[PDB]
Amino acid sequence: QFSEQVNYQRALEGELARTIETLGPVKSARVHLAMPKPSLFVREQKSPSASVTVTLEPGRALDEGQISAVVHLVSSAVAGLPPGNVTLVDQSGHLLTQSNDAQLKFANDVESRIQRRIEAILSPIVGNGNVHAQVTAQLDFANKEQTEEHYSPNGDASKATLRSRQLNISEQVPRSTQRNETSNYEVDRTIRHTKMNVGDIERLSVAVVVNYKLPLTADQMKQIEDLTREAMGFSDKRGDTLNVVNSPFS
Template identity: 35%
Template sequence: SQLESRSIPYKIGSRGNSILVPSGQVHSTRIYLAGKGLPSNSDKVGLEIFDRPSFGLSNMQQRVNHTRAIQGELAKTIARMDGVEAADVMVVMPENTLFIDEQSQASASVFLKTSGPAKLGEEQVRAIQHFVANAVEGLGTEDVTVTNSRGELLSQEQDRDADAFLSDQQLESLRNLEAYLSRKAEEMLTIVLGPGNAIVRVSAEINRDTVTTSDITYDEDPVQRSSTQTTDRTQTPNPSLLSTNATATASSATITTVDSTTMDNEFAVGSTTADTIQVAGGIKKVTAAVFVAKKEKKDSAGTVTYIPREPVELESIKQAVSLALGIENTATNLTVEQFEFHRQEKVDYLNEFQKYNKYKTWISIGKQVGYLCLTLAVLYGFVRTFRKTPIETIPLGVPLDDLGDFAEAGNGNRSSGAQKRSNFSIFEPGPPDERIELMNQLIRDNPQNMTHAIESWLQEDNGKSN
């Protein structure tokens, strides 16, 4: 309809997905349609779906329209991000139930078509996840899946239990640690084995339990705090003395006295108590997997033969990686394996990426040159507008020798002086009244030309005087 309103001839392409216009009108038509917001994704219906009357729609249809509106708005917004050419969003909204236990979790899937072979960064993918999750009620970032047109999963699987204990900053720190350790070992092996001959992946296990540990340390040398001495005296009668010596007194012969002394010493032992609290989120264990490429040997025909590496070399690589990452060299913590690397896909992808970078570079150069040309054009127009334009002599439209002819159309009393006036010009001496009348007549007949003529005469007089 926009093309028909401007009378632009067009026809539909053979596949039905393009519109053809004359080559001379391509650029102007694109600019016009871009100003109208066209072409737009007609299948992306946003909140404008509610602009149409919705009388008679059921609750199910209303929910479907609401979901379509959210999907369309999200897709249109994501498509405006740098590096994204097109986007599709699918949102699954659970139905409301009376029981909370039966309530299902909302989920969403985002399909992206990126510009060129470059992939979106991890931060961009996470931004898309958070953007979609915050736009849909009851949707978490872990329930948003992001894939691209090549069938690659861009979003990372997140552990719900880990999210319950760790914040986003802690999870980001963990991923940064894994990436740093992987890059550290990979760069070391690249120097030794060559580029593209080693792949290192590190996984860190998070401590999800909060543990409190108490350590008590006792001093070896005790300190005496007090000393107590206790004496006990016991007196008992002696029956044998009483039977032999009846006259003995009771005080000397019949009583036996026994004394006992007890010494009590109290010592104090010094102790130190240390309480250690290990919160959730700490690094509990680090494991690593290392893949190295087998040696390659090419013959004269270009055939590649893969030669396995010696076990001693693999053990040396394992020991070096263990020391570089600071982990124990055990089978459960570190493994090193050798494989035949498939490099063709990597080379094709690298060539495609280089072509894309070259294309982007030329586009950037073209934009800069275009901006420079536009700036020069504006400056040139500015100078042309404000520079002094040379004054050209504009003819009066009436020859000076025939100036007297104007009197033929005048009154009859002026016809007698026509011949006299035709023999002089306004620059020649003559009667003052006739010169003034001649000037007035010229101004009335052609005021614009007369104004330019007077300016020209004044400039000529100034030039002669100088």
């Protein structure tokens, strides 16, 4: 009542191999699945995995889009399997799957996006190769948490909310005055549960270098600075920094 499961899983290894292989720039692609296996005691069934090694077409390599394509293929073939745990390798090293340092690549991606946008916007002004920039991005990768409990102040009786109130007043006339007051309020309350996203831009720094035509006019320079400010999405509160210079290139 045991071996048939292993036999089936290995048959499915072959099946997935034959799918992923028959894709064009592939000649062979062999996989090993990582599943809980019948110990009769394990009940938790930790997250599975699937390691694929592929020997592609000589003279060809697979682009990231089709890397994601095949990873989602094999991920959607196996039930209860996160695609992240599926790990793919070329015919010689070079893990095209990224599954502690990914934040470096994410920061680099952010910087590339910003800088490419700057180039795209300023090329019409000064020319294709006449302007260069580099972006430094401060990214915040801390798992933040928040739970705010704003109440509304009810010190003002004109804006309070009495559920119950008892008021006892007594006086004799040599006056003896007495006033016992008891109040139970209902209070206005707000509950936010903020959970800041991991990997947000907390600060940027951008230096812009522009070529000459002889230097540019002052106004053309300041408008260039304003556009690059804009294309940074410049925020004074994030401590963002931008500096622009002009000089002959080489």
